Amino acid sequence: VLGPLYAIDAPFAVNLVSQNGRRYLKASISLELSNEKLLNEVKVKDTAIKDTIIEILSSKSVEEVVTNKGKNKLKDEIKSHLNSFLIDGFIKNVFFTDFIIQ
């Protein structure tokens, strides 16, 4: 049973560290929620959720995000940082519905 699904409206577009210059990530995120009432909370805290994600994504180098293992660690770090200020429920999963490195 897939929990309620929440799509963050806007894509994230950030710098990543690379050997030579910077590289660029475009990521869209959806969250799987533990319950329906967590849906109001993620909408109300939209700004805090985006700023948390931007700060996590913008800390990464390319070589940290080119494997399933690096991406899964990123998803786990997003999930624990968000779950730390959500009180009406918790995020079950983070989904990268788009993940494009340039």
Task: Scan for tokens 């991406």, then name that residue.
Answer: 71
Task: Scan for tokens 């805090």, then name that residue.
Answer: 48
How many whole angstroms separate alpha carbon 93 and alpha carbon 21?
32
The residue ranges of every structural domain in the chain are 5-101
CB 18 within 8 A of CB 61: yes
The experimental method, as deposited, was X-ray
Among 14, 98, 83, 4, smallest CA distance to 48 is for: 83
Among 92, 96, 7, 93, smallest CA distance to 57 is for: 96
Q: Roughly what angle, to the nearest 10 degrees, separates helices 68-83 and 46-57?
A: 140
- For the domain covering 5-101, report its CATH number: 3.30.479
